[PDB]
Symmetry: D3
């Protein structure tokens, strides 16, 4: 299957791209004026070892900028420009009006660099956990970049990680909960059921064998401990120590997506 | 003066906030239903040493969520929760309907964490360069987060760095330029002038004493070398070696804003 | 708990209201001009037996039209104006500038009439099924009114029914499936898992004891037959015969929401 | 002439379609991922006797989903799948990427079902009134579905009915009017004239031979009684009794558009 | 009555204002930063003889910029700063945060200057025609400023002129018409009727006593010659000669709104 | 170079066009219905002596209306229909569906007429100043048409004038300044620098040899007197007297863009 198929042929994610171009040109592209519309060719370079992510998003930038692009690698491919003499790898060949190419350049690269950075981070941690013989799942969180959530959750997937719920309207989560606030797990979980119905899971962030059981009792579908039912462990986990997984179902962490370094990309005309 | 005064009392940056809340609740907040509207109090904690940034943005989230907030620190303040027993510092006190508080929580913290991360990174590098006796400026770039540019450039400022031009519609930049493509620096710079006029500067990314001079000749306002007039050095600079500044006017780097770690923040009800 | 708490204090649902007012006044309200801003009082009448639904939505219309409203009944209340001499019941008392009241009037009533119609339909069918001793759930579908989905799903809830998944991004559903198209239930269900992760359920529309088992095998969370696991029966069910429920978990039908009659409402000034 | 020609080649009605697709896919189409992009063929079935309406709207969904569609019937055609062995009639043949077809499916059918339901209702009542030898007009109202007004008014037209004014910015209507509130019909009608000018009609909802005459006096273009000049009768009329038309010009009723049942439609791949 | 009452308390015209502020501040108000939030007072001056128009629009700018404003004149008032020593007249007194005042300044004045310019032009021509004893109407056209149509039509009204139809969706107009294109006036007018119904007038741009009669025949509500029924004369009319009115009902001209000079306005702090 | 190259291949300026079409057709084009889709040909006429401006904007209207257009003149061309027998000049040849042509007509012409009017005004004043041997620049201002700023600034350029800064986020301007309000030019200019950085100029509206010098001192890039550094004179200048230029760098005036007459354009089908 192809990840980019998760994206509806049309929808808001495409207006996002447009909005991002506007963000770069509120009133006039001077550079395009000076450069003109002559057809040119260009190479899109990956300049660091990592996983290529964001292809369809960058593609959308290339389409709205009316350019012809040929990708040399499939999304998900691991790139190692280091084990290259030049230290860079051409991942795509682009042709079109000069001005168009330069207008797409920054925005497109801001997409790839960040998308790949996350894909790469996710992949390192999932494969790292997989190497210890862990059979469970590594997921993300809702601590995403305001307005960039679709792109980031998508990169998590390509990285080989679980995205965890998408937003507050998806799987319910009754988080630490003194504030949740009165009744019970048992009535907080009943109310949640009452509204979310059968098609959406309910997760409870418990604190004791009792807590959990009361949730399993109420019918919670997932149990969050935070230091037919599913067990999730979350909180300050990272590619570090940290190897301390055990037979618990889920391990969530923002480290795969928030605050992560980027994978450098580049674009130069023939 | 107050940085947040750079933000127009009303404008698109406020619709952004709204859009970000929608991004978190496409259809129903189940958690708010279960939690209810009872008034509660909560503390907003900074959980890592760093500079507090994003106050007005987080404030906008708190206003649209109709809450009462009292900030204990001014934006820009350096926080050191490490030199605290608990390892966390209350930066704001919030009151309002339970559901409202929990709805604002994630989005608000995604703002602060990232805004502060950048503010912090910028501040470290500017102060680091300042300690060596450098008198010039450290700037950012256009390699920003798609759709988050306003927030990121703003954080650069608070961090104590220059933002450099904002977008393609601001200071012109005739970048590496074989593609720029024919004529001269001299006619590329003339055309640019022809369109941008006197109120906006023109920068040329040169390669030789000649290149530069030809630009200084054409009237360029800034000279980019990239390894009454101004000299900018850019490319792969970071908090690392790297201390190799000299009397050149500008040093630009994405390290102060792109791929930077985040400053952890937290929110819990009384 | 209060249903209207499912709605985020702020989000796109409020811009919807605005857009709906624009839909009614593309360029000038002549009636408001002629009527003026004198303060007036008005009664909002329910003119048919049914369940009151859409309160917060109508409230939003009243707020943006800057009016003062006092509701005499809570959302969900069953109204029986028939068992009233006048044949109408005042559900709300409104005060404000004349023009404002008349501008809010139609839009507000279009909300209530439809919201209540659905609430009422849903309630009749759920209570009807409940009277036969059925313990399972009655749900809706995705056959909603383009652009009005939030309002309609919400009314389903108030009606006492399950909303079923909200959109294609929620619970996965592998519907009739020749088109789904090759591999297996088993690999269609694996791929779905691969993308949706643990926080979202997967439903398969099966055709045989085998089909189902293969799904239960693959790990499907729900089984749709369409004439720890859950059984759903769907297709042409209505308040009619039709009483033919049995111990299967879910019965979905658009009859509770699509093509339903409306509950008449009214508004007249003192 | 062709009804769909009423729709501007481009305008907001097309963004509506997009918005409706977003409404169905806030973040990821899982089904498309699993199904893939292989080309498939499909039949669009009408499953109930009624008039086909909404063609260009459904077409817009098919275009934005990049599919090839061939319609077998013209909009307005009366369909009678009942007088068919299978009980269904193929109204369109569609080809394109699997995922695209399934993404367009629901939204498209929600359009057709509702559009046809209204077209059908309108047509039944207009033809019903026409059979008694009535020569006047049957119109709709402003009690439309919030945000769907364009689609519904359009269906009224295809149904063979008058749409009546479109919104508050069109023909003025001085409705029951104690609230309209002081002066006269005569000065309310003068003020209205004062603002609307000659290109837009003014209607007054009168109560007595005097009322009307005073309006005809003031220059009203239409007279609404509500139980060179035109007479309109409105209020609780329906396909029921109700045959009680007489030589009055207009009979308005929401029954042709609000609360109406839908015409079932269907889509299955080869 | 009050003209500004034509504007719905809420609707798209208010988002327009916001959008206009964004147009002035894509990323940062530097001036506000430097000026600060200290409360200041300011006078809004009219600097040329003319009619004050655009009050509610400017008011909306002042509200979104959170300022306190007190108007010294009612909209429509004729101002003659020339017959003043200073040559300027204070039309409004404003108070609020410094930065806010300066941010509202330009946008607000761009509103007033243009709105008043049109109001003034319209008023001169209507009163000019009225002085010759003409009893008919002077109207505008659809040759308005892209995106500013609401503001301009509104100013026409205040100027004392007719706005004529608002857009293509209002009164139908079968303009010069070889292109309209085949059949007849008689079938073009029938088709138009067929779609627009009774609540909207149909105008035909005729060329001969026959043309007109055929239209009056078909049922046209207005007759446009262009050099119970109504006669309109249009084409190149202006405040110039040009006094050549006669007993024909309407005289339309863009001169009252398009290409018109502006009325200078000003704003300075205490 | 080509001016229209200043416009990004895609961005908000294109949504503007769409929005402008919606502004003309909120609900139904009756005229298109009656006219039909038959292919027709048409000539776009310039009806007054002036400079052709707005080509790409009008082109965008023609593209969204799906028409084929062939321009007979390049943007910037000076047209003199007066020195033509007919008194009109065909500037473009258009082909496409009848309805489409008529729908594009008004909006397109509203673009050209205004764009050319400004281009023409600007050109007259720049060439007028150039004829006296002035070597400096003539610029515009921020007194533009709300929402039309991009189109107007663009026309200024084609007219051969400087646009001056675009918005408040570009070149800083510390205008009359009692309100700016305390400290100094020297600290207002320092604060401005502090936020705008090196890539954006700072202009100070001075009053005395001292004022200026203090600014030149603080580092201002431009000096505005208003009756390596640059001198600007602004205030009430026009094509009138007024020839009183001297060796000062800039002369700004709204006369080239605000309140200017329009250049008449026309469109008729074969
Ligand atoms: O990998 P990590 O980034 O630690 O993310 C996971 C943790 O974050 C959440 O709590 P948190 O207290 O951080 O929510 P808050 O920031 O809104 O208060 C969650 O319950 C996890 O414990
Ligand atoms: O601190 P840094 O991130 O190195 O950013 C600064 C460098 O990036 C730019 O070139 P680059 O070749 O990166 O532009 P591209 O990525 O679009 O091709 C710029 O000319 C600088 O040399
Ligand atoms: O209560 P009801 O309205 O019957 O809704 C429920 C039925 O509709 C769906 O199939 P359907 O074949 O109707 O989907 P389609 O219309 O897109 O092809 C679904 O599988 C159910 O069988
Ligand atoms: O066919 P019907 O649905 O009866 O629609 C027609 C009636 O509705 C209107 O009054 P109504 O009192 O319903 O307006 P309101 O609901 O806003 O108060 C109108 O004056 C008609 O009498
Ligand atoms: O006062 P005025 O500006 O002359 O406006 C009025 C005239 O403009 C229209 O025709 P026109 O041929 O101008 O329409 P076009 O510009 O789209 O072809 C209209 O039929 C009037 O004759
Ligand atoms: O060519 P002109 O239209 O005169 O434009 C130029 C003048 O306008 C500005 O001041 P102004 O006092 O007009 O700003 P205000 O209208 O906002 O108060 C500016 O300082 C110039 O002096
Ligand atoms: O964002 C968070 O706090 C979070 C952290 C870990 C898992 C899930 C979530 C979530 O909210 O969905
Ligand atoms: O984004 C970049 O490539 C860039 C890098 C360094 C300085 C400035 C910029 C800029 O484009 O403004
Ligand atoms: O809309 C449908 O076809 C549908 C019908 C019954 C249940 C669920 C759904 C759904 O798609 O979620
Ligand atoms: O919506 C209504 O109340 C209404 C009812 C009947 C005719 C016309 C209308 C109308 O408002 O245009
Ligand atoms: O804009 C025009 O061409 C026009 C000119 C004169 C009157 C009316 C109109 C109109 O179209 O409504
Ligand atoms: O708009 C103005 O007041 C103005 C007037 C003259 C030059 C520049 C400007 C400007 O603000 O940029």
């Amino acid at each position: 299957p192809v990840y980019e198929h998760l994206l509806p042929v049309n929808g808001a994610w495409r207006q996002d791209v447009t909005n991002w171009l506007s963000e770069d040109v509120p009133s006039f592209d001077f550079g395009g004026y000076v450069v003109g519309s002559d057809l040119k060719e260009a190479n899109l370079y990956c300049k660091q070892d990592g996983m290529l992510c964001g292809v369809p998003f960058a593609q959308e930038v290339f389409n709205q900028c009316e350019l012809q692009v040929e990708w040399l690698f499939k999304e998900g491919s691991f790139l190692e420009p280091s084990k290259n003499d030049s230290g860079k790898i051409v991942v795509a060949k682009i042709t079109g009006p000069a001005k168009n190419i330069l207008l797409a350049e920054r925005t497109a690269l801001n997409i790839l660099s960040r998308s790949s950075g996350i894909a790469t981070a996710s992949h390192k941690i999932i494969s790292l956990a997989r190497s210890t013989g862990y059979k469970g799942t590594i997921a993300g969180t809702r601590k995403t970049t305001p307005g960039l959530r679709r792109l980031e959750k998508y990169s998590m997937l390509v990285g080989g990680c679980d995205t965890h719920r998408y937003d507050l309207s998806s799987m319910v989560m009754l988080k630490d909960n003194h504030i949740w606030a009165t009744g019970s797990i048992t009535n907080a979980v009943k109310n949640a059921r009452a509204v979310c119905g059968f098609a959406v899971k309910i997760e409870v962030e418990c604190l004791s064998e009792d807590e959990a059981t009361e949730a399993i009792e109420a019918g919670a579908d997932v149990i969050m401990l935070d230091n037919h039912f599913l067990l999730e462990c979350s909180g300050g986990l990272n590619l570090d120590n940290l190897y301390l997984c055990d037979d618990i179902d889920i391990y969530s962490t923002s480290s795969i997506h928030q605050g992560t370094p980027v994978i450098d990309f580049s674009l130069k005309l023939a």
